[PDB]
Design a protein around this ligand. Structure first.
Ligand SMILES: Cc1cc2nc3c(=O)[nH]c(=O)nc-3n(C[C@H](O)[C@H](O)[C@H](O)COP(=O)(O)OP(=O)(O)OC[C@H]3O[C@@H](n4cnc5c(N)ncnc54)[C@H](O)[C@@H]3O)c2cc1C
Ligand SMILES: CCCCCCCCCCCCCCCCCC(=O)O
Ligand SMILES: CCCCCCCCCCCCCCCCCC(=O)O
Length: 563
């Protein structure tokens, strides 16, 4: 009723990060009728604009409220896995930190035409960095905005960097400079524009909403991809929900269907769409169009645990939580005024934007990312505490002052899986994050040795001056067996999720798409989102997505080639 006898050259399933890039590039001439179906609403919320209000998007209408299956290995828990639900997708709901990983992360991909020398100029082509002059590793004209965080906790960030130095770490002045080693302490840059969040809706989609060849519908949840027997021919969606009409959007001659539904819902939509392993599809009575055993496998996610600790009494009031809430739980009016008049203060802060990369056991690249936060966690599950901080507003209590150190296996060997649990295209997928299931216990050994490392740093003379003890895991967690058991019951997601539709050389029976992002054994079907990532890079995964979506877009329209 909105695609009415109209045909599209590109149908984009999803209105997310990679989608917001692609629409911009693909719609940029005038010869292409681009479509962009987003299940979520429009991007118009003030909680999305303000970095600190990310504590309000967890478990919110703007989130898919996805929970994993029972994880036997994780004290028989379901694991909440945040995912954005709106135009801009997860770039609207994320912690905004800007990472590329290391040059060695893309060379180990092994795929042709995507070595570190291949991907570097797409990273830089997409960037306007406020804090690095232009060079081989930093851009000045690209659509993304990147800056150093404009909040600084003068006492507790500097004691963190001293601590790190006291325990023998060396400073990294730029984690995205591939000409030195990835490891060390320092500040993470954030995807922000003078303290306002610069999601991919803001930086890409929004400035081209006036193009007449660009059609973007929200509320439009796609149910499958029409594949006449192989050649895709459209998608089927509903503008109302599970209780709505089953519309259809047609492709024009030589029109392609781009999957941008994320690493959770794209393999999900692929299995419903007849693309998956026959055995899993035969179980729900789904016909098999292409039998690729890679769909839904290889789910990679970076698992986190934390330690938290209160400061001494003499330092009550110097936490970022003291700069955001007052002693009665109301937002400080001064924090609001700095933010609006000047883009400064606690409200520009996703909190976890200072840290380190450490090698725990002399590995080739760092296995451990530390994120330091000068607020105190109140639950061992970091995400939970963030939700608790949102609900804490105006309750009447003082949030206690202290620091949190989050620890993350950033190059984790464990993999997961996404699958079908119901024939209902509107049901939550079968989702198993798979943490701590690698055969060598390597992920577990990183997080445990992260717990020893964070207590070392908390013991340094620079940090012990501020701290009074340790709340999590607590003084009763001393043995190695007690630390792994603390990790198992508290392990949360640092929210990455890659690899569920991986690319690889021709002759890879494990792969889903090829190095040109088109899935094997289907015509005019391609995937351009975090799914294709064959191997998660040491770092938050949003920037590599944009590079994947830019490269894909010039490739489509003739500006670049791969291999
Ligand atoms: C809480 C959180 C914090 C993060 N923090 C950081 C960080 O600090 N730095 C960083 O670099 N990365 C971060 N990430 C990761 C980064 O946000 C994601 O890796 C990236 O945005 C994924 O982009 P994408 O294009 O793969 O998918 P998404 O941005 O997830 O887009 C997929 C879209 O598909 C839509 N969709 C799903 N099903 C359907 C359907 N049936 N019909 C229509 N549309 C559908 C979804 O609503 C969504 O908008 C974070 C992730 C989260 C969740
Ligand atoms: C914890 C999140 C705080 C968000 C505060 C936003 C205040 C908006 C006032 C204008
Ligand atoms: C931004 C607002 C910061 C408010 C302070 C909240 C109190 C402690 C925060 C600790 C975060 C631990 C790691 C969790 C991050 C990912 C969810």
């Amino acid at each position: 009723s909105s695609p009415v006898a109209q045909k599209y050259d590109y149908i984009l399933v999803g209105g997310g990060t990679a989608a917001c890039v692609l629409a911009n590039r693909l719609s940029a001439d005038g010869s292409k009728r681009v479509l962009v179906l987003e299940a979520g609403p429009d991007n118009t919320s003030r909680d999305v604009k303000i970095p600190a209000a990310i504590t309000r998007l967890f478990r919110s209408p703007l989130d898919w409220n996805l929970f994993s299956e029972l994880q036997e290995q994780l004290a028989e828990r379901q694991i909440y896995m945040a995912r954005g639900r709106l135009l801009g997708g997860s770039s609207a709901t994320n912690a905004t930190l800007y990472h590329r990983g290391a040059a060695g992360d893309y060379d180990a991909w092994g795929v042709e035409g995507w070595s570190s020398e291949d991907v570097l100029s797409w990273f830089v082509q997409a960037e306007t960095n406020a804090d690095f002059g232009p060079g081989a590793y930093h851009g000045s004209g690209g659509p993304m905005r990147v800056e150093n965080p404009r909040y600084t906790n003068k006492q507790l960030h500097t004691a963190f960097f001293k601590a790190a130095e006291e325990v023998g770490l060396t400073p990294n002045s730029d984690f995205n400079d591939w000409s030195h080693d990835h490891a060390g302490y320092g500040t993470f840059q954030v995807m922000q524009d003078k303290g306002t969040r610069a999601d991919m809706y803001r930086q890409y989609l929004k400035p081209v909403l006036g193009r007449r060849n660009l059609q973007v519908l929200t509320g439009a949840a796609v149910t499958k991809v029409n594949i006449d027997q192989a050649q895709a021919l459209g998608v089927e969606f509903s503008t109302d929900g599970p209780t709505g009409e089953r519309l259809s959007a047609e492709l024009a001659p030589g029109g392609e269907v781009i999957m941008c539904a994320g690493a959770v819902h794209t393999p999900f939509l692929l299995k419903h769409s007849g693309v998956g392993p026959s055995a899993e599809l035969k179980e729900f009575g789904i016909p098999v169009v292409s039998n690729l055993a890679g769909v839904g496998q290889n789910l990679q996610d970076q698992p986190a645990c934390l330690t938290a600790a209160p400061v001494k009494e003499k330092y009550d009031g110097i936490a970022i939580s003291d700069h955001i809430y007052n002693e009665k739980g109301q937002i400080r009016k001064r924090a609001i005024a700095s933010y609006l008049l000047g883009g400064r203060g606690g409200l520009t802060s996703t909190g976890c934007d200072r840290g380190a990369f450490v090698r725990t056991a002399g590995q080739a690249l760092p296995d451990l990312q530390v994120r330091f936060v000068p607020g105190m966690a109140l639950d061992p599950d970091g995400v939970s505490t963030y939700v608790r901080f949102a609900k804490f507003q105006s309750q009447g209590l003082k949030w206690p002052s202290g620091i949190t150190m989050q620890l993350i296996a950033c190059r984790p060997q464990s993999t997961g899986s996404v699958g079908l649990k119901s024939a209902d295209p509107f049901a939550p997928p079968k989702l198993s994050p798979g943490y701590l299931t690698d055969k060598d216990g390597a992920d577990l050994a990183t997080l445990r040795k992260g717990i020893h490392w964070a207590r070392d740093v908390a013991r340094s003379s620079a940090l012990s001056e501020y701290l009074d003890g340790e709340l999590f895991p607590g003084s009763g967690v001393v043995s190695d067996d007690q630390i792994d058991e603390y990790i198992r019951r508290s392990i949360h997601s640092s929210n990455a999720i890659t690899g569920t539709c991986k690319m690889g050389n021709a002759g890879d029976s494990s792969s889903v798409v090829d190095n040109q992002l088109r899935v094997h054994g289907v015509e005019g079907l391609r995937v351009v989102d975090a799914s294709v990532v064959p191997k998660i890079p040491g770092g938050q995964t949003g920037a590599p997505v944009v590079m994947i979506a830019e490269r894909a877009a010039a490739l489509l329209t003739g500006k670049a080639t791969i291999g």
